[PDB]
Amino acid sequence: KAFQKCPICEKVIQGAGKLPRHIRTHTGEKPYECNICKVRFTRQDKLKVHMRKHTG
């Protein structure tokens, strides 16, 4: 596949568009927000699993 290097930590990350996920570990930015409980996450899949709690 393809790999990327972190500009901050120099750790090798395997991901095409997965670098921003590792970037949001140092700065802790949360662009995704829940519609109901307003809980914020740094990853789209993490927001999806939170939505799974609302609808059983």
Place this chain on the structure above:
DNA sequence: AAACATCAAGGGTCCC
């Protein structure tokens, strides 16, 4: 105080 289940953070991998 081991054994055990649960949740989440972080990374790998596939598929569209």
Place this chain on the structure above:
DNA sequence: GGGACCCTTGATGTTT
């Protein structure tokens, strides 16, 4: 590249 799911590890709560 974004969406989606899985694998590994550590903190926390149960239970006996």
